[PDB]
Each structure stands twice: as C-alpha cells, then as structure tokens.
Amino acid sequence: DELYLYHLTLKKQTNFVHSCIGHFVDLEAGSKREQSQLCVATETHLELYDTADGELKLIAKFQNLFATITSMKSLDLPHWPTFLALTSDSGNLSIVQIIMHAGALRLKTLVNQPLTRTTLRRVSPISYMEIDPNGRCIILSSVEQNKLCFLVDYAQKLRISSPLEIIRPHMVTLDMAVVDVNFNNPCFVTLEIDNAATQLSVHLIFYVLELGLNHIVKKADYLVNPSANFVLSLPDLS
Amino acid sequence: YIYFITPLLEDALTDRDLVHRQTASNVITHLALNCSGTGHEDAFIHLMNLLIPNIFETSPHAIMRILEGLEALSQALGPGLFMNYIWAGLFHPAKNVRKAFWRVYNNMYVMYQDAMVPFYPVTPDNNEEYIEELDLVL
Amino acid sequence: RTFERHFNEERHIYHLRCLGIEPSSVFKGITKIKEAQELWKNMQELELEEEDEEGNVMSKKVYDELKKQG
Amino acid sequence: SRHQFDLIMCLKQPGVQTGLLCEKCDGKCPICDSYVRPKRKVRVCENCSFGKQAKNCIICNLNVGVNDAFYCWECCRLGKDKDGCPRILNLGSNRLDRHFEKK
Amino acid sequence: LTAMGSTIVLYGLGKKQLLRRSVTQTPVSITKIVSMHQWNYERLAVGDIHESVTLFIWDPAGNVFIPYVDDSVKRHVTVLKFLDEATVIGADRYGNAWTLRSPPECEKIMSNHDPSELSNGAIKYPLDVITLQQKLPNTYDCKFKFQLLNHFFVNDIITDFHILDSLSNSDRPGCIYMGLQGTVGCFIPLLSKGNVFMMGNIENIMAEADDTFYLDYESRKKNNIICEGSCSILGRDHQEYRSYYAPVRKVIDGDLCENFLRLSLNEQEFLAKNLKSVQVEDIIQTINEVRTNYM
Amino acid sequence: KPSLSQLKSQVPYPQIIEWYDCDARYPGLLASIKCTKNVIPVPSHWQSKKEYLSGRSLLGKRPFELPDIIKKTNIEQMRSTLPALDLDYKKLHDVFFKIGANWKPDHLLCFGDVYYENRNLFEETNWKRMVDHKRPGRISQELRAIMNLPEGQLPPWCMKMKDIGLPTGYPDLKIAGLNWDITNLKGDVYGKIIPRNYFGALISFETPEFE
Amino acid sequence: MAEKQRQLKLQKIYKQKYIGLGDESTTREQWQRNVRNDTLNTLQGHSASLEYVSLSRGDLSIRDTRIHLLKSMSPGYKAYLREE
Amino acid sequence: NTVYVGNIDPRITKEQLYELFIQINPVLRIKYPKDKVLQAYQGYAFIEFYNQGDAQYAIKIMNNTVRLYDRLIKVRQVPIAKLFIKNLADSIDSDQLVKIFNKFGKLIREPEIFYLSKLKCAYVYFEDFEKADLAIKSLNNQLVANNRITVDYAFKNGKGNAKYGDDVDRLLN
Amino acid sequence: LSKGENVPYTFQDEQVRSNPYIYKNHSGKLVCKLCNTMHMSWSSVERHLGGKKHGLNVLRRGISIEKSSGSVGLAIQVNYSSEVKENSVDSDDKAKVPPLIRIVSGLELSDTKQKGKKFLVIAYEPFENIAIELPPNEILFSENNDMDNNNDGVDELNKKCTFWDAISKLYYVQ
Ligand SMILES: [Zn+2]
Ligand SMILES: [Zn+2]
Ligand SMILES: [Zn+2]
Ligand SMILES: [Zn+2]
C-alpha cells in the first residue's frame, strides 16, 4: 500500500561555489606541465575544465559525491601534479587527487583527517579554508569557537602533521584571506566580531604561525569600524 | 523482524521491576540504530511512547540504558518528531523534570545542531528578536 | 486533592453557570470570581454585485433585502 | 569507559596517529566496548602520543598495544566517533584494588 | 481561489471590480499560506511557512473549507502538489522533499459521509480520536494526522514540482521537480515488490562500498583504497547525508546506484560477490532500465 | 508571579495551563511553548512519589502471549512453559517473510499517546475489536440465550419502536416487519443498515525468496 | 556518586566544544541566543537557503546577505543599523 | 449524555452490554464499575452516548423491555438567602411565617422552626438578598403575636458578605 | 520454609489456601495483594504476615467488608438418621437447634433459568436442604391459631406450625 520511490538527478546543480586554479593531470600529451586548468565544485557537484586553447573546455564530470563541499582549494607543494585540498561536511579534511585511471578520469583520495562532527554546524572548522601559497600548511577555521591548521609535508607518501589549535570562545570569524610569505612563516588575517558584546565591534586580527615553537600566535589586534567587510593580502612591497 | 518483537518489548517496558525496563531499552538501541531509515517508524513511535515516562527513573544503569534508547530512537523518528515530546518540560517549574529533560536535550543537541534548526518552537512574539528572515517568501 | 475535585462538582458548576460563565475544563484553574469574568470575556462579509455593478460593495443580506424589494 | 565510571577519557582534537590495543583488549570499541563489526581507526591527540605512553593500550593503559583500535559501527552512526581522543587517563579503582588486594 | 495571510478567500468575477464569493478562516496555528493546491475542485492542501500542510474540502451550502487532517511535524513548505486524492508531495526551505498520505480511518469517513456533516452535525468518531482531542488539544485539534509516506533530502530548494502521467510514452507516471540552484530530478514510483528489492540491494552495496574496500584492505594486510573515505572520496555515509533533517523512508536513491556503472570491472565484480543473486551484467541491466524504459 | 487567569489569557489553548505553570521561572514563555502546535506534555507521574510503578495496577497483568502468527508455528506445543524440536526451516522462513510480510500488531500507538501507569492496552484492543464485530440489527447466540430470544423472533423492544419510531442515530436501520420485510428475518439478523491505486500501486507482490 | 561526578565533567567539556548546551537553569535569553546563532548559521551555510534569502531580500550581492547574517549574531548589530 | 443502567447480573460482561445497547444507538463509552476487591461488578452501569437525543430515546425504548438472566433491566436518566430569627412566638405556624415573609420576598423553600436553649427560632429562605434586606429592615426587633422577634442572617460568620451579595446577585440573574 | 504449600500464580484463575493473599506474580517474585508488597524469599513473607502493616490492612479489609453485603393444608414428615453417623459429633454445638423451614422465591437460583413459584425449604446442619414447590398462592395460611404468645423462635411460621420429635428424629410440618 506504501509508495516506493526512485530518485534521479537529471541535470545537476549549476551554481558554482568553488574553484581552484592548479594543473591537475597530464592528458593526451606525453610530457607537458602548464598551470592553466581549473576545477569547479558546487556542494555535491564537481567538474574539471581546461584552458590554453583560448576557450574553456570540459574534461571530466566526476562521480556523485554525496556530501556538502564547504571549501575547495588547490595546494601546490614543492617537489608533481597539483591535488585539491577539499573540506566539506562530515568534518573531514579531504585531500583529493584527480587522476587518469582505466579509460577515464577518476577522483582519488589521499588523506582525510577527522574534524568535529558530521553535519554543517557553526563549531565545525570548515567554511573558511585557505592554504599557504607555498603549500606548507592547510589552514581551516569555523565561525565562533575554534581555528585549526594542518602542517603539510610530502614524501614517498603524503603526510599531514597533527593540527594546531587556537580557541577564541566567543569570536565569530569572517573573511579568512591569508597573507603570502617568502618561507619566513605562515601568516593569516581574519575579521573577527564578538558574539557577546553590548556594542557592535568587529576587529581585524593577524596570526603568525611560528614554525620554531609549532603554535599559532596572536600578533596584532586592531579594532576597525563596525562596517568592516573583507580582507586581502598585499604580497611584498619591496 | 521488528513488528513481531514490539509486543515483546511491550511487556518488558511495562513491567514493574527496573531491570526489564533497563535491558529492554538496550534492545531498542541496537534495533533503532540500524533499523532507522528502513521505513517502519510507526513501531518506533510506539516504543518511544512506552519509553518517555522512564526519563524520571533513577539508578545509574537503567538511566544510561534508557538515555541511549532515546538517542537511538531519535534517529529512527528524526530530530523533530522526537523533539515534540521534550520541548514541553524543557523549562517547567519543577527543577527536576527540568533537570531530567535538559539532559536529553543535551544529547540531542550533540547529535544534531543544524538538524534541529527548523524544529525550534519560536514565533516572532515568542522571543524578542526572533529572525526576520525566516518569514520571507519569494 | 479534594479542592482539585471541587472544580468539577455540581455546586461549583452552579456558581460558574449561574454567574454567566459556561462551566468547562478551560475555566478550571481558579477560585476568584473576578478574574473568571475577564477569562469569559476573552473567550467571547461578501460582495454580492448589484446589477448596476455598483453593488460590488453590497453585502449578502443587503442584496437579499433588495431581492425582497426587487 | 562504559562499564567503569571512575575512568576519565581525554577528549582532545584527534591527531594523525592511530591508537593501539593490547592483545587482551584487542578488538574492542574504546567507547561502548563492543567486539563486533568495526568501522574506522581511532586517532589520538599529540599529548596522548609523545613517548612510551604511546605504545600502551588505549583502554587499560598498562599493557603494550599491538593492533590498531577501531570504532564500532554504531558508535560511528551515533557520532561518538568524532568526539575527541578516546584515551583513558587514570587507571580506575578496580585495577588498583586488585593490585593491592593480591599484594 | 486566493490565500490571504491567515485566511482563504474565494473570488468570483464582477464588473467594476471582482468580489468575494466565500471567506474561510484558518485554524489557529496557520499564519501565512505560501502554497496550496486542489484535487479536482473537491479538495485542498494548504501549506504554511512554519507548519506543514492541512487538507480541506469544499463544502457547498456551508460555503466554507473544513480541515479534516493535519501534520505531526513542523515543516517549512516552498511548494506543494496533490499526487493523488489522498496523498501530497511538498518541498522545504531546508532541502527536504516529502510525501504525506491521509490515513485510511479518515478516508472511510470521507467517502462515507457528506462534507456538511463534518463542521456541524454528528459523525460518530471512534472513542480514541475523542480522548486524543481532550488529552491533546494543541496537537490533534484537527482530527487524525498525516502519516509520513516518503521523506528524502536533496540539498536544493525545490521551486516547482510537476506530476506527469507518462514520460515519453513510458508506463510509470513520474514526478519531475526543479530546484532553486537549478536542477531537475525525478521520483519514479517502482511498481513491484521485487524491483524495489533489487534496487534496494544495489543501494546497500554501493552505500558502504567505501567501508568494504577498507575492511578488505585491513584484513588482507593482516594475512597475505587505502583511505577510509576511499570509495566515497569524502566522509559522509549515504544514510546520514540523505537523512539529515529526518530519515529517508521509502525513497531509494538512484543517483548512488548510478555510480556503479562508472566503477572499474574489478571493483564491480568485487562488490557483486556480496549477493547470492545475479551477476554484474544483470546489475548494470537493472540500473540502466530506468532511463531507457521508465522515461 | 502572574496569576494563571492573567496567564491563560495569553494562550490560544488556555485549558492546558495549570496552577503550577504559574510558578515557573519563565511562565510567559512556557505557556507559549506548551501550547505550541505539536508539543506533547511531560509525562504526568512527576510529583508522584510512587517510583512511577506501584504494583496495585501491576499485580494482575498477564505474563505474555505470542503473536498468533508465531503461535501458528506450533512451538507452543513443542516446548511446555506454563506453569529434537524438528521444525522445518522453510516453514519458519515462510512465516516471517512470505506469510507475515505485512503483519503488524493490532494496536501499536499514535503519535500523541503516552503510557501512564494505570493504562492497559489489552482492554483497549478488545474495545476496538468489540466495536468492529458488534453491529446493530444482529445479536450473538449467547446473548440470545441470555435474553431467551430464539432466532427468527423480533426483539422485545420492537413494539416500543413501532410506537416511538426507529433509532435516532440509525436512519438507515432496516428492521423486520416495520421498515423492512419480515420474511427476510432469519437466524440472528433482525435488522441491517441499508444506505484509486494512489499513484503507487505496486501491481506485483514478491517476497524475498529463501532458496 | 562518581558517575554523576563524571556527568558534570563531560557536561563542562561538551559545553565547551559544542557551545550552547542547557544545563539545568538557563535563562530564556541564554537559550534564545543559541537558537538565533544556530538558525543564522543554517541560513548562511547552505547555499540553497542563502540563495533564497538573498533573492527574497533583493540584495545586490550574495556576500551582502551572508555578512548580514554573520553580523546579526552580535547583539549590538540591531542598534548599529538604527544609527545609520 | 450518559444514562444510568441498573438491575444488572454480575455475570454480565461489558461486551454483552455494548452488544445490547448498540442496537439502540451508537454508544460512545461504557463505564461499568467493578469492585477491584472482589473483581465483581456491582450490578449497575453508566452508558454514555454521543448526544442527548440518543440518550433520551434509549431511556424510552429500553426501560423495563429486556430480561437478562430473567432480570428486567432498568434504564434511567441522570446558594440562596437565609435568615435566622430568634424569640418567635409559639403561636406562629410555619404557614403564618410564609404569609409574613412573602410580602418581603419570594421563598425558595419553607422556613425551618427549631428550639434552642425552649427558644423558638427559624430559618427563612429568600430568593433575593435585597428582599431579605427589606424583611430585616421592617421586621427586625418587632412585636408579633405579642412577642418581640429578632431577624438577622443565619451563620455559615453569617451570610451577607460582599462576595455573598455579588454571587447571590448573579445566581438570581 | 513454605511448609510445602503450592502458592499459585496471580494469573491462574482460582484446594483451599492457607493465607489467601501471598501469590507469585507473572514474574518470579512473591506478592501480598492487600499490602501490595513484593517479597524476595518466603522468610520475608513470613515476616510480612508477622508484620504490623499487614495486620492494619487485614482490619481495614474487615471494616470494608462489614459495611456492605375449614380448608385444606399440607403436611410433611421428614425422617433423620438412626444414630448411624451422629455418634461422632456431640459437642453441644447447636445440637439443641431443631430443623428450620423457610419459604423461598424461585427468583434466585444457582442456574437462574426458570422461576415463578415458592419452595418450603427445610434445613438441618449436617443433612442437605430440601424443597417443596407451592403453586397454590395460599394454603393453610391460618388466622390467629393460638392466643398470641410471643416466643418468636425464628419466625411465626416455625412456632405456628412445626413439630420436632427430637427423641425419634422426626420433623413434621403443617
Ligand atoms: Zn588524548
Ligand atoms: Zn588493554
Ligand atoms: Zn562502539
Ligand atoms: Zn500484606
């Protein structure tokens, strides 16, 4: 008497929330390496596109992911294709390498580190993700509560260091954009607004991860007017 | 296999001594966890209706097994259909019923944060600020 | 307990009923005659189109009255 | 643990390293102590690894561990998997009272 | 048939303006009516913002709609449609796609009685429903309830449902929706108890496949796909992600069973050994049947 | 501490509010939650010191009874309980899957039901089963022996219905010799009431096969 | 005894990790704040419910609605809008 | 909506009652009290129908119609001014009291003559507190039948409070 | 401990009991249905019966019970035993009490099937009761036979028209 149903997605969700710029696989060429290529994801859906022909081409539309991808970034690490560092629901940092397997491109996982709990939730250190431009450390955060940093290493096998925490209990975070560095030390900037305050105060704050002592440091805290929006990094000035 | 054993759990959850009510809830944990999403869900409402009165029961062993039982039934019924029982005495005058229900609300909150969001009992006049954007329609 | 049973009784129902407040379960919290009165006080348009097409404001019963005069 | 109340777990951010169980505690979920259907590997925080203490079993923390410790399927469904580092710290009253009872 | 914020109004045409042919006040709980639909001028289904849906009847000579059924869970409805006389599909703000069925005990009363009897007059209800009215006036105030028929989590916000009697001459009537982010998807009813059993077993295979590869890997390292999320590429289980706000009930995902086609032959023949049933080729046949035949 | 009369005035369903709801820390909010749509009240055995079960109701409960489907499997005779088995595996496997596929308990419970101590379901199921079989116009042979009313004989109230008329709640009731033919009276029946596919119809029913 | 004394401890830990958890006595304000934060996080997190809010409010850009929701989590944000 | 039933065989079961009375009308509920001491019913019942009309019709049809175990079943259906008066004359009959107090107020019931200490006193029931105010105003400390009589309110300390005036005013209205 | 007595289960639907209270419920444990007490072992039961609360409940049940609950005539000649079995019982226990007669209406019988006539029942302690149907509304119902002497015995019927030859054991009634 019941009603049994069968679901199909005929045409996938089309609103692209994420992109990453790296060079992923070597296709149809014996040896070629060029940084022009891009991978684009919307929550569940994911795709790979190519360039350098002057006009963007579709390469591969990968298998159904069945999750909510909350950030996607290409990390490039010194000494090699690029693989995308991908955080999502399930609270798992998932470093994924798209590859050429059998007859068609496949989406292959390398390391997924457990974080928080499996859902979208405000404590979950996702929704803000960025990578040191030299590929030394992935860095994650959440609104309110915690911020994490994983120190990336590469060897015969990919290797992820244990996370580095900073816990600011009431500070809810926005616009995590990270400053590039010369190998000196990874540094990143946030606009943090306080959850419990009698007035509206959004202050920008700098963090410098000290590779020497292996912890993240609060360096400069500057209060700005409540209308603050976002942050970008200026590379050098020298 | 459920369907047969709910009248068996019927007598177990009813019985006087506190051991049957304990041990039977342990059946409800292993049954509700891996039978969730199968589409029965009309037997788990029955089982819950038998469990809820046991929340006030003391002793460590029965209370942890009962709580685990309610948590397993949360995934069989779903967060909201399970919450409809709790919101009532979640405040309450009695300092005890309150102390008892805030625990189940703690476990439910740990299992579900954004899963309970549509299900809060909040209207614009129920709380001061509410959220103006939940009332928008396009 | 005896007082909680006093709320459903012949006599108390005679006091509510003879006071003018219809006795029922909703009125069982309370002794005092004053507040029950405010409780009872808190307990207690169609456009039928005249042929001229100005009766678009004209109510049902009004258009029935003009059925009687018409 | 589940059966013994005086025990206190760690519950910190799980690191990249897997816990280990002694031959005696082998094949048990650190949470509910269920021998059946394992699911995932446990992971322990830095402050639970460091030196020799890393080699000990993560339940009894006395004997040396060998096999990786697994979360049972149910504790992964309930999500008690990802709470934190599931390493027992204190030894509990039972083991001590045994030790001094014998001699 | 228009919906004010609280109340439902029925307008007919007139000259110099249009006029109110009927007005019906809603029960206390309903605040706004976001979407609503009819069944062949006999019945209504009315959605809210916060609460779920309520089914009415057009009562002539009472010139009013009388609620005979309500829902047991708070659900925020974007859109709503009658699948049949007794059942309804709806969507949610939060990405849920659900289907409700009015219980049979109510349907016997609905077929065996006139609408005018419902509002006033006597339909003798079983004592149970009454005692539920006295015991729970806030819940059961509108008698009976819905029984949840299907529930499914598709992360979009479904804007429109479209029920079709046939898709490209196919036998099984489907229902194709379209979401906010843009999407199209189809719920096809499976007519058999056998095919839902095959598709069920295939969904169960593909569901924990990422767990099967992993436990196999460990077991073959003990005696002689490295990641735990190997075949899922991410961490979500199928039942958890597809459940979320509430457990899936009868809806079995065909977008998971459709990935089995894209696996390598070694992996397909590896997963298929879990069944005493038919081989891989027949699995691919069963999967590929729905797009060929059913639409 | 606002009086409950002042408190009941805020509530669309004021009949739930109780004298103790006056005394909550947040009575205005609690009165809004408790009367919100689907919330089911706290079980009522709080403020009782009896540990939620006192034997007075529990002394007379029946030990247990197997479902009729399982009792059909004959184990009741094989193993003696109150106060080598040789069972067919095909039979048992057919009982749970093929035979009992759709079998569900008679009662279960609805969403709003909560089980209070003195409640007993064994009576309520017998009351549903009672309303189902017992019908107007018919009388059981046992009750006919109690009334000394042989078959084919009109009941003793037939005359007062001749004077006063048919039952009010039974307009469609047909009684022999009055609104309905007297010869059709036979046996136990002296009167009788004489007034899809749901889009998912499975059209095939196949249980999982053992072999 | 010792079991309850573990219950208090796990209470303090989970209240730290997961932020809002009612204990026994929690003011209506303390709880309604948690409800507000959860709701806003759901509205911003899912790109669906963010599209819906952005189109409904008719704002010029998605990021304006998202930052509006984040800012709304601070109490002083209401008064800040009133001073404009 | 509930009717009383009596002269029931203790051997009768709720099943048999329901089967009997459903012939007459739909029966909402049957409360058929049992002694929980002896598990033996007391031979009476309360049958609650859905409306009043069914109850009345059932009373009319089923009363003394049917014999259950030879036993013929039975079916059946189911605050004012007061004045104390002291030092009355022994020549005053209750009817003379009636004629005295009628002009002041309409008597809901008859007066009650009782002897205290020897001392003839009475209670007089009026339908109105104001009519009783007239009776006290004129009759208090007045000589009738060559005996001085005193008229006041009867104790419950006596009637005539403010709440008494209010709720008596309502019961009248 | 139990003195070898079988204590039946609560559900067995009643061999006379010693104390008609202590049972075994559907479970194993022992119960006292008055006091609603659960006892683990028979010794605890014997302590319950020897306890003070059970006595109070027995008395309260006692009060609870004690508050509720020229013409034609016929002549009968009933004969009794010839010192055959009455040789074992002679302890002046109502032995001086003669047989008694009463007129009973058939409206009440163990079977309750047919009725509508009276019976002239005659009873004696050991022997079984005896009845005689009286269709005639009235026979031999006299009018002040003796001169109003008041030793009611049992009733006007017995003194008025009965004789008990106790020496020969012959009861005459007319
Ligand atoms: Zn640790
Ligand atoms: Zn160990
Ligand atoms: Zn476990
Ligand atoms: Zn006793």
SS (H, E, C) chain D: CCCCCCCCCCCCCCCCECCEECCCCCCCCCCCCCCCCEEEECCECHHHCCCHHHCECCCCCCCECCEECEEEHHHHHCCHHHHCCCCCCCCCHHHHHHHHHHC
Q: Which 3 state secondary structure label does DSSP give I95?
A: coil
End-to-end CA distance of chain F: 71
G2·D8 Cβ contact <8 A: no
Ion ligand 3: residue ranges with CB closer than 5 A: D 29, 31-32, 34, 72, 75
**Rounded Cα gap, residues I125 and E249, in angstroms:** 76
> D12 vs A116, D29, D87, H137, H145, CA distance in Å?
10, 18, 9, 89, 102
Closest C-alpha to H83, from H52, H56, H57, H104: H104
The CA F48 to ligand 4 mean position distance, Å, reads: 23
The CA D62 to ligand 2 mean position distance, Å, reads: 7
> A63 vs A23, A108, B77, CA distance in Å?
20, 11, 31
E249·B84 Cβ contact <8 A: no
> B86 vs B22, B83, F186, CA distance in Å?
21, 5, 57
Task: Decide if B125 touches E, using CB distance below 8 A.
Answer: no
Most A CBs within 10 A among B113, B116, B117, hence the mutation to make, goes to B113
Q: At residue D83, what is the residue type?
A: D
F143·H19 Cβ contact <8 A: yes
Q: Evaluate the omega torsion of the peptide bond into residue F155 and state whether it is cis, within 30 degrees of 0.
A: no
For F198, which residue in chain E has the nearest alpha carbon? E84
Cβ pair E102, E86 in contact under 8 A: yes
**Rounded Cα gap, residues E204 and E252, in angstroms:** 10
**Rounded Cα gap, residues E180 and E183, in angstroms:** 7
Q: Which residue has the tokens 């184990």?
A: F75
Q: Which residues of E touch H26 (CB under 8 A)?
A: 124
Task: Decide if D50 touches A, using CB distance below 8 A.
Answer: no
3+ Cβ–Cβ pairs closer than 8 Å linking F and D: no
- What is the resolution in angstroms? 3.4
Q: H52: Cβ–Cβ under 8 A, 6 or more apart, which residues?
A: H1
Transcribe chain H into DSSP letters: -EEEEES--TT--HHHHHHHHHTTS-EEEEE--EETTTTEE-S-EEEEESSHHHHHHHHHHHTT--EETTEEPEEEE---EEEEEES--TT--HHHHHHHHHTT--BSS--EEEEE--EEEEEEEES-HHHHHHHHHHHTTEEETTEEEEEEEPB--BS--HHHHHHHHHHH-
Cα dihedral F111, F117, F121, F123 sign: negative
For E188, which residue in chain F has the nearest alpha carbon? F200
Cβ pair E21, E10 in contact under 8 A: yes
**Rounded Cα gap, residues C14 and A207, in angstroms:** 77
Q: Which residues of A touch D15 (CB under 8 A)?
A: 162-163
Q: Are strands A202-210 and H45-49 parallel, antiparallel or unpaired?
A: unpaired
Closest C-alpha to A20, from A66, A91, A71, A92: A71
End-to-end CA distance of chain B: 46
**Rounded Cα gap, residues B124 and I79, in angstroms:** 97
**Partner residue opposite E74 with nearest CB, options B76, B118, B135:** B118
The CA D76 to ligand 3 mean position distance, Å, reads: 7
Cβ pair E239, D76 in contact under 8 A: no
Cβ pair F204, E194 in contact under 8 A: yes
Q: E100: Cβ–Cβ under 8 A, 6 or more apart, which residues?
A: E52, E53, E71, E87, E88, E90, E146, E147, E148, E149
A165·D82 Cβ contact <8 A: no
A161·D16 Cβ contact <8 A: yes
**Partner residue opposite C38 with nearest CB, options F4, F9, F19:** F9
Angle of helix E280-293 relative to helix E195-222, nearest 10 degrees? 140
Q: Which ligand lies nearest to the CA atom of residue D10 in the structure?
A: 1
Cα dihedral A61, A66, A70, A72 sign: negative
| Radius of gyration (C-alpha) of chain F in whole angstroms | 27
What is the edge-to-edge ordering of all strands in the sheet holding E96-101?
E80-82, E87-91, E96-101, E147-153
Cβ pair E49, B137 in contact under 8 A: yes
The CA D15 to ligand 3 mean position distance, Å, reads: 20
Structure tokens of H156? 């419950």
Most B CBs within 10 A among I11, I27, I31, hence the mutation to make, goes to I27
Can you say how many angstroms the Cα of residue A51 is from the centroid of all Cα atoms in its chain?
A: 22
3+ Cβ–Cβ pairs closer than 8 Å linking E and G: yes
End-to-end CA distance of chain E: 34
Query: Environment class of residue D50 by beta-carbon count within 10 Å: exposed (0-12), middle (13-18) or buried (19+)?
Result: exposed
Cβ pair H160, H153 in contact under 8 A: yes
End-to-end CA distance of chain I: 59
| B8/chain G closest Cα distance in angstroms | 31
For E200, which residue in chain A has the nearest alpha carbon? A6
User: Which H helix or E strand runs over E260?
Assistant: none
E215·D41 Cβ contact <8 A: no
Q: A213: Cβ–Cβ under 8 A, 6 or more apart, which residues?
A: none
User: Which H helix or E strand runs over A11?
Assistant: strand A5-11
Cβ pair E151, E251 in contact under 8 A: yes
* DSSP 8-state assignment for residue F189: B
Cβ pair A115, A125 in contact under 8 A: yes
B131·G42 Cβ contact <8 A: no
Task: Decide if D54 touches A, using CB distance below 8 A.
Answer: no
User: Which H helix or E strand runs over C13?
Assistant: helix C10-19
| D89/chain E closest Cα distance in angstroms | 27
Q: Which residue has the tokens 């399982």?
A: F70
Cβ pair G72, G40 in contact under 8 A: yes
Biggest CA–CA distance in chain I, Å, is 76
For chain A, list the contacting chains (3+ Cβ pairs, <8 Å): B, D, E, F, G
Closest C-alpha to G39, from D74, H99, B43, B122: B122
Task: Decide if A184 touches D, using CB distance below 8 A.
Answer: no
| B34/chain G closest Cα distance in angstroms | 26
Q: After which residues is chain C broken (C to N over 2.5 A)?
A: 44
**Sequence ranges of the domains in chain H:** 1-78, 79-173
Residue ranges with strand state E in chain E: 2-3, 8-12, 19-24, 36-39, 43-47, 53-59, 64-65, 80-82, 87-91, 96-101, 147-153, 158-163, 175-179, 184-189, 251-253
**Dihedral of the CA atoms E148, E153, E155, E158 (nearest 10)?**
-30
Phi, psi of F130 (to 5 degrees): -65, -50
Task: Decide if F33 touches G, using CB distance below 8 A.
Answer: no
Task: Decide if E136 touches G, using CB distance below 8 A.
Answer: no
**Rounded Cα gap, residues H173 and H168, in angstroms:** 8
The CA E149 to ligand 1 mean position distance, Å, reads: 45
* DSSP 8-state assignment for residue E75: -
Cβ pair A108, G5 in contact under 8 A: no
The CA B33 to ligand 3 mean position distance, Å, reads: 12
Q: At residue A80, what is the residue type?
A: W
Phi, psi of A77 (to 5 degrees): -115, 145
Cβ pair F116, B53 in contact under 8 A: yes
* DSSP 8-state assignment for residue F205: -
* DSSP 8-state assignment for residue F42: P
Q: Which residues of E touch C45 (CB under 8 A)?
A: 20, 23
E124·H50 Cβ contact <8 A: yes
The CA D32 to ligand 3 mean position distance, Å, reads: 4
Task: Decide if F199 touches A, using CB distance below 8 A.
Answer: yes
Q: Which residue has the tokens 């002679």?
A: I90
**Rounded Cα gap, residues F110 and F131, in angstroms:** 19
Experimental method: cryo-EM
**Sequence ranges of the domains in chain D:** 1-98
SS (H, E, C) H90-125: CCCCHHHHHHHHHCCCCECCCCEEEEECCEEEEEEE
Q: Which residue has the tokens 């006539």?
A: I117
Q: At residue I11, what is the residue type?
A: F
SS (H, E, C) E161-177: EEECCCCCCCCCCCEEE
G2·D84 Cβ contact <8 A: no
Cβ pair B69, B23 in contact under 8 A: no
| F42/chain H closest Cα distance in angstroms | 27
Q: Any bridge partners for residue B3, and if so which? A: none
I26·F63 Cβ contact <8 A: yes
**Rounded Cα gap, residues I174 and I159, in angstroms:** 11
Query: Environment class of residue I121 by beta-carbon count within 10 Å: exposed (0-12), middle (13-18) or buried (19+)?
Result: middle
For E157, which residue in chain G has the nearest alpha carbon? G48
Can you say how many angstroms the Cα of residue C59 is from the centroid of all Cα atoms in its chain?
A: 23
Q: Which 3 state secondary structure label does DSSP give I168?
A: coil
Q: Are strands E175-179 and E158-163 parallel, antiparallel or unpaired?
A: antiparallel
CB atoms within 10 A of CB A207: 20
The CA B1 to ligand 3 mean position distance, Å, reads: 23
Q: Any bridge partners for residue I48, and if so which? A: none
C47·E20 Cβ contact <8 A: yes
Q: Which residue has the tokens 């394992």?
A: D38
- Residues of G in CB contact (< 8 Å) with B are 3, 11, 14, 18, 20-26, 28, 32, 35-36, 38-43, 45, 52-53, 55-57, 69, 72, 78
Query: Environment class of residue E267 by beta-carbon count within 10 Å: exposed (0-12), middle (13-18) or buried (19+)?
Result: middle
**Dihedral of the CA atoms E148, E152, E155, E160 (nearest 10)?**
-70
